[PDB]
Write a protein that binds this DNA or RNA. Structure first.
Ligand SMILES: [Mg+2]
Ligand SMILES: [Mg+2]
Ligand SMILES: [Mg+2]
Ligand SMILES: [Mg+2]
Ligand SMILES: [Mg+2]
Ligand SMILES: [Mg+2]
Ligand SMILES: [Mg+2]
Ligand SMILES: [Mg+2]
Ligand SMILES: [Mg+2]
Ligand SMILES: [Mg+2]
Ligand SMILES: [Mg+2]
Ligand SMILES: [Mg+2]
Ligand SMILES: [Mg+2]
Ligand SMILES: [Mg+2]
Ligand SMILES: [Mg+2]
Ligand SMILES: [Mg+2]
Lengths: 117, 45, 392, 176, 101, 236, 322
RNA sequence: CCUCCGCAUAAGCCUGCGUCAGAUACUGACAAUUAACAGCCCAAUAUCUACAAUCAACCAACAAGUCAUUAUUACCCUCACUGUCAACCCAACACAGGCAUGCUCAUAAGGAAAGGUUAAAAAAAGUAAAAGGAACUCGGCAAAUCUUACCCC
RNA sequence: GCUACCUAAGAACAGCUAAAAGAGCACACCCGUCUAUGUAGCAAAAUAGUGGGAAGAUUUAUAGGUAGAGGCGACAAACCUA
RNA sequence: GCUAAACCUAGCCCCAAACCCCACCUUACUACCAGACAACCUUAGCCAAACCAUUUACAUAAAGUAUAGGCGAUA
């Protein structure tokens, strides 16, 4: 009889309560006998770096110069990454300079994005 | 003797007044549209 | 009359749009939209197949393209085959002559009181009572529980005779053993893939029961035929099979020689339970299959009269009724309907007890029948013990 | 170790804990991808510690020491996420020309409203997906009247807003 | 990570890796007596116990022996001046038993 | 409604199939026939009314053995599990059909008339005139559709041309191509007609709901109507 | 409502909690043809016996070790019957249930219409030992009743729930494996097979390397306590009629390769608060560290068979009533 | 002194007598229900599956019945997610009503008919009653007893 | 989600007499004969007693179906959210 | 002297001008499996005719004119 309360797995008969989740991404599948097969590749692997020797504390000293915000753009990235090599080889096949015709064949395809975060 | 005609059961609730059932037929689609036009906070049940 | 009504059969796809019929023009479909819209032509999607192999979403190749597909149909007999004609069908399939009653050679092993177990009656009564009443917390244990239990407890009671008979240390009781044996009868390729019950396996073969004179005498006996029922009825016809004679164990396995096939019909439901005749037929076929696998392993895949007949015993049971069988395979030349024929001694419908009362029946507050077995027949357990002791 | 979930023991109980300034987006833009990756976990550990402090302060019914540093950490993490997103977006635009990381399409739903349907990942093609085919992406003629009604409701709301704004402006001018 | 589309995994594909974790957890004082080796956390609702185990073992190098989770229902009984129910957020609670005693 | 007929099985089998009662309701959910509903749950036994159905890879007349004669909940007449070659099948048992009997099914129309033996299936042209038949087919190979109830027996009257005249149990005459098959003798359970229900509960068990309580006036149709027997129904 | 105690439990340090629930003190240690037969069973279940269906690791336990342990028990019973006459008449049970229901401690109802009322802490153990031997003559006490051992029973400072342990309300069963009418009422040995969820490899992956012995020990304590208590209550003793003689039992718990041996002596059914207020008795469980029967099986050969482990099994089977 | 009950599961509800502080079984804050129980399943293509249940044994049936695989091909390499609280739900209510199942068959569990006083009428429930015993009344309604025979439908 | 009927697959029916019973007495359970109270009531149909059935045409939990020019009905113009 | 009494702006009415991250059709707000199923078809009635039955409305001027109409209500 309650319509304004959110629909959660805590409401409904046993089948409903079992079937609905809470947003947790699936980790595997179910086989005969309701046995859960967990796939390792489906478990997110936290790629935590080595923080030893890292010099960047969470906060920044207040005695730090203030600089104008310059959001990175495609043009800026091209100028700072590709333009030098392009100029050199023009003075002296874009794959050599860096362009990749197709995202297929890459582990990290930019579009459609296939990596987390 | 009367008064307790509502014997709650979420299965019947959702199978009778649910979003899927309302969208199943054009009449229910228009019901949802009427609720949306009126501004109801609860379009379906 | 065709089975399956139209309303249940798969719906026919809707008629194609006339735009497709029109030759020179390319139809405009909602394929580019990636979803259905009722005002555009329905696309003709090319057949799709996932590029990679995916178990749990795998479709087998069509039957004819299976590597083992064969035009010649092999008729397989498995644990859940219920022959229509029963014992006659089994005898015809195995080229076997039936002898009512167990052989004197085995029956005499229990005549001497020394082989007799101490307190046979009391021990067997205790076994029955444990299997049928005391087994589980349930008030009335089901057959699926008290059939395997009764068989195992009887086997343990027999095994207790290791004191008297040290030779009983050369036998084991293997479970989940499966054997396979193929042979031809009247140009019919018949296979037996026997699984299920327990296999008592010895380190030594069983002695032959019948003498060569009796084996020759089997020539005159003629297989009882049955018309119009074919001998193949109730056997799984299979066009995708592998003709292989497998004894169920890798070469060099200790305890290789089958000594008993303990088959149990533990289905709770009567229809799901074999009839006594069908169970005896299953016993015949499994004993023949095990013996034939042994013969093929030993003397090779040659159709010939065995110079050393192979003996296999079997005990079929339903928890209350038992059937005892001793099968002597003395020929692998099965194709021909004439010649020396294998022979099986059978004792049928030997009921260990007439009935068991799990609760005391009370009439007018008077106990008419006490809890426990009624009509106990120690002769059946004597036959059981004789079979177990045979070869020791 | 679990000690990383709590502030320094010397800091425990201190009424105020002095903290630096939150990382700025411009400052972060100078840092390498590996440096940002490490700083993300540094800030994550700090954020976990500060959230633990907040919850424990609520449990003890006491004010959280220096509550502003939690906001500073959240701002720093947001700036780092924005910088990484900017770099990823620039690279995606350069290599593919797509301005959205997730495929999608403008589609008309069953209610006649134009939505940006964001595509989901499937193993079978759409023409075979049963649930997708159940989902409807077209509005039948009976929805046009409700589309008009919603349009007119929006127009009425907008007209009321504008007329009220003009009334208020005129009252202000008369008052001053 | 949360509020992000997980790249669909097909059989034989690469391992799913998350570089900048989005899950932030709280170490909370238990409200009831707990075993000495048990730690209580409040977790994002989208985090599995496997995710929490890897999170703790990778970011904090905490040897985790066992993890259990439960979804605590936040009260919806409270009402504002407009008689509209105020929903206390539901939250996931994780009990983590440390390893090596 | 979502009514889907339970008659979806496509492969013939001997196993009792799990039926689903209708209660007289059409697929739309509305009552189409009154007085049907409830009763003991039943399982359907697929009857092979095409008695001459030579087994796959086989042809010509063949014999079969009657394993047993069994009560059928779905039929007034009892059935028989008849097995031949390497197949079994349910058929409609005739009056004096016992287990172990041999039943012949032939397609041969000999010049003379076959010696009719109860239970066997022969083309109508092969039967002597005046024999009692049952499970008659409208067309050659269509399958038995007439004279299938308990104790019902049609009569073979005439064999003019390549046709046969059959007196149906309702006494109507029927012309069928003589190639169509029909079993000899009368259907089993001949005493079904003399079955006393005894109690309204037994009707409810059988699945017949009570008649409507509304009172109906009897019109002109009610009176006893004596009519000439209808003309022959031809299928040639 | 009662806590369902699982002998084979994934709960960490469950052995100490079970010791508390049982008033049990754990003590390290204990109070040729056979080798050929054991190797024959191992090779029969690993190499010789042809399998029609491919065997998956998740069912390897059930389809390999369980038949292997059954074969070991049966064949060893047959072979040692000459040297142990009582073992001849014993009853061998496969996966027969063993139920024990008891009360241990009290609790104040925390919430609800019954808040503040004292309620007993009921426990039920429902075990299914893979094999077990039941006799009609009780075994001899391993140590005299009232055996004072300095070791102190572990104490639980929190609720039993915190150890993953959940309450239910179902039939309270006290069952030794056969009904009370069965003459073979005393216990001789229980052969337990650990389930796949408790694999040594899985524990090592889960960082529970310390918990292998804990799993074995908890399974032993729970199962043997349930069995001995069921035997005692079949004999008529209970909390207010505490046992007048020790009730002894033995167990071997195996993962398929590693075996551990346990001896349990029930000296106390007075576990309730009322009967335990001034009870000096306490049950005892002797246990041994898990040892591998064999190192590896390569095709037709078993490498490094442990004659000492085989002799431990043989000695347990050779134990006889006095 | 009462015990209709009670304890659990299901269904339903959704934090709804746990701690602290304020008020005057309320408000605010804090905490909590941890999976083994239960839900959440199953690779294809063919191919099997006559013989109820009822202690299943006799008997006895009719209304004719909940329970079964094989053949080949694929496939292990990996214990997630969700319910778990309460004095509770449907009846506008702390409603004498409705409410499936397992055990307890009177309980070990759960509860309090009397706010205090007096002991008027009338009213309700109950108990007892001299002699009589339907004379009451439309009628033996009610109550008390255990009680024959004849008629309509 | 009440109710009329139906569909799927479930569940309940102590004890006694009799014997395979739309059998008898009688719990649970279903119903509601008669009386009293109540009549803005505990209750928009209840309570107490009394009473009919209680192994069947029985009762009942779950999900589904039939929709108003209609449905369903052992016809009471019944019932289809007081 | 208590209940209380009042209050001015929250907004609204009529016109003009001007055209207006993730989840979610399965039990919606549910990461992740072979679909096939697809929309279009006269408004009626109240009411008036004092009933009702044909019938009864849905820039200016020509003009309420020509016409229609149980030639009447009215159109
Ligand atoms: Mg209801
Ligand atoms: Mg009538
Ligand atoms: Mg859980
Ligand atoms: Mg009171
Ligand atoms: Mg008073
Ligand atoms: Mg008187
Ligand atoms: Mg009078
Ligand atoms: Mg009188
Ligand atoms: Mg008078
Ligand atoms: Mg009276
Ligand atoms: Mg009864
Ligand atoms: Mg009756
Ligand atoms: Mg009438
Ligand atoms: Mg009337
Ligand atoms: Mg009018
Ligand atoms: Mg008027």
């Amino acid at each position: 009889a309650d319509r304004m309360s959110k629909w959660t797995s805590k409401r409904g008969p046993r089948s409903f309560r079992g079937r609905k989740g809470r947003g947790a991404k699936g980790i595997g599948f179910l086989t005969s006998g309701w046995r859960f097969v967990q796939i390792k590749e489906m478990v997110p692997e936290f790629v935590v770096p080595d923080l030893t020797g890292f010099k960047l504390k969470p906060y920044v000293s207040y005695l730090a110069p203030e600089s104008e915000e310059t959001p990175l753009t495609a043009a800026q990235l091209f100028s700072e990454a590709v333009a030098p090599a392009i100029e050199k080889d023009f003075k002296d096949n874009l794959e050599k300079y860096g362009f990749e015709p197709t995202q297929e064949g890459k582990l990290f395809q930019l579009y459609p994005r296939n990596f987390l975060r | 003797a009367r008064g307790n005609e509502y014997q709650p059961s979420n299965i019947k609730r959702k199978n009778k007044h649910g979003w899927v059932r309302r969208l199943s037929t054009p009449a229910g689609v228009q019901v949802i549209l009427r609720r949306m036009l009126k501004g109801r906070k609860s379009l379906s049940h | 009359y065709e089975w399956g009504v139209r309303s249940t059969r798969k719906s026919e796809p809707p008629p194609l749009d006339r735009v497709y019929e029109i030759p020179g023009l390319e139809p405009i479909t909602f394929a580019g939209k990636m979803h259905f819209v009722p005002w555009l032509a329905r696309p003709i999607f090319p057949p799709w197949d996932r590029g990679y192999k995916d178990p749990r979403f795998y479709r087998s190749p069509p039957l004819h393209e299976h590597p083992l597909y064969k035009d010649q149909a092999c008729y397989i007999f498995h644990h859940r085959c219920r022959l229509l004609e029963g014992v006659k069908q089994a005898l015809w399939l195995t080229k076997t002559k039936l002898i009512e009653g167990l052989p004197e050679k085995v029956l005499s092993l229990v005549d001497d009181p020394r082989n007799h177990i101490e307190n046979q009656d009391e021990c067997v009564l205790n076994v029955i009572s444990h299997a049928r009443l005391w087994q589980t917390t349930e008030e009335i244990p089901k057959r699926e529980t008290y059939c395997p239990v009764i068989v195992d407890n009887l086997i343990q009671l027999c095994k207790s005779q290791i004191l008297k008979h040290p030779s009983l240390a050369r036998r084991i009781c293997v479970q989940n053993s499966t054997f396979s044996a193929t042979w031809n009868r009247e140009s019919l390729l018949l296979q037996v893939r026997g699984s299920g019950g327990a296999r008592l396996s010895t380190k030594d073969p069983l002695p032959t029961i019948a003498s060569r004179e009796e084996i020759e005498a089997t020539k005159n006996h003629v297989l009882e035929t049955f018309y119009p029922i074919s001998p193949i009825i109730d056997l799984h016809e299979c066009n995708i099979y592998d003709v292989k004679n497998d004894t169920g164990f890798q070469e060099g396995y200790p305890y290789p020689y089958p000594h008993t096939l303990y088959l149990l019909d533990k289905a709770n439901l009567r229809p799901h339970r074999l009839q006594p005749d069908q169970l005896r037929a299953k016993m015949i076929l499994f004993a023949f299959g095990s013996a034939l696998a042994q013969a093929r392993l030993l003397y090779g895949n040659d159709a010939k009269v065995l110079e050393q007949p192979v003996v296999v015993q079997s005990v079929g049971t339903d928890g209350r009724v038992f059937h005892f069988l001793v099968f002597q395979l003395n020929t692998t030349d099965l194709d021909c309907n004439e010649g020396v024929k294998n022979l099986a001694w059978v004792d049928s419908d030997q009921l260990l007890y007439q009935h068991f009362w799990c609760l005391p029946v009370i009439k007018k507050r008077v106990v008419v029948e006490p809890v426990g077995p009624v009509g106990f027949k120690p002769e059946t357990f004597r036959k059981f013990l004789a079979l177990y002791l045979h070869g020791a | 170790g679990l000690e990383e979930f709590f502030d320094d023991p010397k800091n425990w109980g201190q009424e105020k804990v002095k903290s630096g300034a939150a990382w700025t987006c411009q400052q972060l833009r100078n840092k390498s991808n590996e440096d940002l990756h490490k700083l993300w976990y540094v800030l994550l550990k700090e954020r976990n510690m500060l959230l633990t402090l907040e919850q424990e302060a609520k449990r003890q019914r006491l004010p959280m020491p220096s509550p502003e540093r939690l906001d500073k950490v959240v701002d720093s993490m947001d700036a780092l996420d924005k910088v990484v997103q900017e770099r990823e977006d620039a690279l995606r635009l350069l290599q593919t020309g797509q301005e959205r990381a997730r495929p999608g399409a403008w589609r008309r739903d069953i209610f006649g409203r134009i939505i940006w349907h964001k595509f989901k990942q499937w193993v079978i093609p759409w023409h075979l997906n049963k649930r997708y085919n159940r989902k409807r992406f077209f509005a039948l003629p009976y929805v046009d009247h409700f589309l008009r009604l919603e349009r007119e409701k929006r127009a009425r709301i907008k007209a009321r807003k504008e007329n009220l704004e003009r009334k208020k402006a005129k009252i202000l001018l008369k008052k001053f | 990570a949360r509020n992000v589309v997980y790249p669909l995994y097909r059989l034989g594909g690469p391992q799913l890796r998350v570089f900048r974790t989005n899950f932030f957890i709280q170490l909370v004082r238990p409200g009831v007596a707990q075993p000495e080796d048990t730690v209580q956390f409040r977790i994002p609702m989208e985090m599995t116990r496997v995710d929490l185990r890897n999170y703790l073992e990778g970011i904090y190098n905490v040897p985790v022996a066992a993890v259990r989770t439960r979804v605590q229902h936040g009260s919806n009984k409270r009402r504002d001046h407009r008689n509209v129910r105020i929903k206390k957020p539901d939250y996931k609670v994780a009990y983590v038993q440390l390893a090596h005693g | 409604a979502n009514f889907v007929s339970w008659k979806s099985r496509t492969k013939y089998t001997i196993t009792p199939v799990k039926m689903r009662k209708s209660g007289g309701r059409d697929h739309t959910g509305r009552i189409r026939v009154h007085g049907i509903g409830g009763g003991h749950k039943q399982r359907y036994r697929m009857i092979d009314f095409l008695r001459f159905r030579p087994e796959e890879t086989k042809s010509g007349p063949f014999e079969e053995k009657v394993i047993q004669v069994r009560y059928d909940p779905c039929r007034s007449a009892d059935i028989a599990l008849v097995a031949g070659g390497s197949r079994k099948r349910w058929i409609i048992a005739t009056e004096n059909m016992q287990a172990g009997d041999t039943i012949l099914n032939s397609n041969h129309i000999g010049r003379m008339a076959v010696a009719a033996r109860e239970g066997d299936a022969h083309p109508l042209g092969a039967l002597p005139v005046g024999t009692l038949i049952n499970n008659v087919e409208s067309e050659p190979g269509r399958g038995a559709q007439y004279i299938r109830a308990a104790g019902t027996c049609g009569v073979l009257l005439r064999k003019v041309n390549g046709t046969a005249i059959i007196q149906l149990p309702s006494k109507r005459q029927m012309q069928v191509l003589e190639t169509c098959v029909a079993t000899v003798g009368r259907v089993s359970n001949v005493d079904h007609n003399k079955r006393v229900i005894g109690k309204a509960g037994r009707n409810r068990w059988l699945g017949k709901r009570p008649n409507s309580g509304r009172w109906h006036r009897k019109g002109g149709w009610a009176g006893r109507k004596i009519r000439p027997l209808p003309p022959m129904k031809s299928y040639v | 409502m009662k806590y369902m105690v699982y002998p084979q439990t994934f709960a960490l340090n469950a052995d100490r909690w079970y010791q508390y629930f049982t008033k049990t003190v754990f003590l390290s240690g204990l109070p040729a043809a056979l080798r050929a037969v054991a190797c024959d069973c191992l090779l029969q279940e690993h190499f010789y016996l042809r399998r029609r269906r491919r065997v998956h690791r998740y069912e390897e336990s059930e389809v390999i070790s369980l038949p292997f342990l059954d074969q070991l028990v049966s064949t060893l019973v047959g072979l040692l019957s000459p040297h142990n006459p009582a073992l001849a008449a014993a009853a061998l049970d496969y996966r027969c249930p063993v139920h024990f229901y008891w009360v241990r401690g009290e609790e104040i109802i925390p919430r609800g219409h019954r808040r503040g009322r004292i309620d007993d802490l009921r426990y039920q153990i429902d075990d299914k030992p893979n094999n077990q031997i039941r006799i009609s003559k009780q075994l001899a006490e391993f140590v005299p009743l009232d055996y004072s051992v300095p070791i102190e029973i572990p104490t639980i400072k929190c609720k039993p729930d915190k150890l993953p342990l959940f309450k239910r309300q179902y039939e309270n069963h006290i069952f030794v494996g056969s009904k009370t009418a069965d003459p073979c009422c005393y216990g001789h040995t229980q052969f337990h097979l650990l389930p796949d969820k408790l694999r040594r490899e899985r524990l090592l992956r889960q960082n529970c390397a310390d918990q292998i012995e804990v799993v074995f020990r908890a399974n032993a304590i729970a199962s043997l306590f349930a069995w001995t208590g069921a035997q005692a209550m079949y004999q008529g003793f209970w909390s207010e009629a505490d046992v007048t003689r020790p009730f002894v039992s033995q167990a071997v718990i195996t993962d398929g390769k590693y075996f551990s041996f346990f001896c349990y002596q029930l000296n106390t059914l007075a576990l309730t608060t009322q009967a335990d207020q001034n009870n000096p008795r306490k049950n005892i469980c002797w246990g041994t560290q898990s040892k591998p029967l064999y190192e590896t099986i390569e095709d037709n050969d078993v490498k490094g068979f442990n004659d000492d482990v085989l002799l431990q099994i043989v000695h347990f089977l050779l134990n006889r009533p006095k």
